[PDB]
């Protein structure tokens with residue numbers, strides 16, 4: 493029996509391979525998470541089938557507590573693994589079994605260069621510059637439930653204007669380029685664009701300390717096996733090599 | 746009540762200074778003590794803190810038997826292990842780690858003004874000695890490492906028995922008294938380098954690890970503590986808790 497792997501298209505984690513031949517099966521995909529998935533399959537000795545999740549979402553719960561996206565697939569036993577930049581959160585951990593993190597990140601700010609803005613505190617105290625995050629993502633949920641006075645003031649801004657929240661990273665990146673808009677985005681993706689689009693930069697440091705984990709249904713025996721494999725991959729400096737493999741662009745002066 | 750095994754290690758678990766004799770859990774204070782009180786209240790359990798007898802974190806011997814807090818958890822003599830216990834693959838095969846409550850990496854503790862800039866600089870030369878705490882997580886990393894730089898560095902530490910120190914307190918002195926660089930976890934480096942302005946961190950972080958709460962394998966408290974640690978992080982409580990205990994006179 494092969495494992496069902498649900499995932500999403502997100503640079504540079506999972507991308508479509510380009511080729512002259514028509515590609516079938518797992519051959520269609522490439523990226524950091526694809527290399528990580530082949531490495532886990534190598535260590536644990538299993539075959540898998542990659543399926544893009546249909547609703548194209550990571551996992552948010554509605555007012556009635558029901559989930560969507562990849563997290564729902566794991567809950568409904570419709571998938572064995574969720575290999576994607578799936579942020580480890582307490583609410584998601586109460587529904588699925590996260591492996592230990594394979595990559596660290598924190599929430600930060602994507603914005604233009606040449607601005608006296610030095611922190612998220614500067615965005616909260618002003619109104620001319622609009623800010624937001626990907627709707628129903630981990631970052632937006634952080635601001636929604638946070639009690640820090642600065643982040644409470646920022647969430648009142650995002651929730652009041654529905655256009656402040658973007659559908660995905662691509663729209664948020666586009667909005668920071670076409671309007672006076674700052675995107676609250678996870679640091680790993682910020683590092684990826686700031687090395688390829690020299691117009692954008694990171695503002696301030698990291699506001700929190702989180703990680704990406706491999707999602708499994710609760711009670712899955714593969715969680716602890718993947719955790720140990722991720723630990724072996726880190727100690728062998730291989731998570732370091734394959735991250736530098738996909739994150740290194742031309743750079744920005 | 747749950748039995749919690751731990752170790753004396755600044756600033757995670759320390760003896761609370763007092764004129765009168767302290768008994769029970771009142772004897773201890775520190776970051777891990779504050780974390781345990783926070784976890785105990787969230788999960789609603791009572792506990793008894795017991796310093797592990799052999800005074801060790803957890804290493805394997807020649808016969809494969811564990812010692813320290815890890816063995817304490819395997820033999821079910823303790824329910825939780827609240828200490829700066831580094832999450833490693835070999836330990837994860839023996840106990841159930843919670844998700845990390847603190848991030849750290851291996852780095853270098855050495856004197857200021859010295860030319861050494863990285864661990865690779867230490868490997869290429871021989872006049873400046875280097876090592877780590879014996880049978881700790883750092884030493885075990887170099888012993889099993891296949892990276893060519895770390896394979897060479899482990900040959901150096903193992904060749905001269907004095908390169909391995911007994912604990913952090915002795916290792917800090919060897920950087921303060923000899924031409925010696927200590928391979929130390931970054932969180933402990935950050936703590937001392939703000940108290941002893943003659944020491945500094947050489948280079949960046951060599952790897953990326955974390956401290957986790959140890960439980961016996963199959964413990965129902967693992968996920969409960971994991972979720973509680975995640976809530977503590979999202980509520981900025983782990984940030985307040987670390988800043989409280991990472992004090993010092995400060996160094997320019």
Ligand SMILES: O=S1(=O)NCN(C2CC2)c2ccc(F)cc21
Nearest residue numbers: 580593596701702703844846847
């Ligand atoms: O979501 S976690 O498993 N627990 C929260 N943390 C703690 C702040 C150290 C971190 C820090 C870095 C990670 F990669 C994961 C986590």
Ligand SMILES: O=S1(=O)NCN(C2CC2)c2ccc(F)cc21
Nearest residue numbers: 592594595832845848953954955
């Ligand atoms: O021991 S872990 O659970 N898995 C290894 N990592 C990965 C380098 C991201 C990290 C990074 C930071 C942590 F706090 C824990 C861990």
Ligand SMILES: C=C(C)[C@H]1CN[C@H](C(=O)O)[C@H]1CC(=O)O
Nearest residue numbers: 550577578579626629630631678
């Ligand atoms: C690319 C997207 C929308 C994902 C990636 N990790 C977060 C998650 O797992 O929810 C989202 C980013 C964010 O919310 O800042």
Ligand SMILES: C=C(C)[C@H]1CN[C@H](C(=O)O)[C@H]1CC(=O)O
Nearest residue numbers: 802829830831878881882883930
């Ligand atoms: C203080 C000591 C000996 C401990 C703390 N964490 C590591 C562990 O959990 O093994 C050790 C440090 C190190 O190995 O560099």
Ligand SMILES: [Cl-]
Nearest residue numbers: 591592843844
């Ligand atoms: Cl875990």
Ligand SMILES: [Cl-]
Nearest residue numbers: 794795796797
């Ligand atoms: Cl005792």
Ligand SMILES: [Cl-]
Nearest residue numbers: 701846847848
């Ligand atoms: Cl931390």
Ligand SMILES: [Zn+2]
Nearest residue numbers: 729732733951
């Ligand atoms: Zn490396």
Ligand SMILES: [Zn+2]
Nearest residue numbers: 729732733736
């Ligand atoms: Zn590298």
Ligand SMILES: [Zn+2]
Nearest residue numbers: 820821822961
């Ligand atoms: Zn028992």
Ligand SMILES: [Zn+2]
Nearest residue numbers: 981982984985
């Ligand atoms: Zn804070």
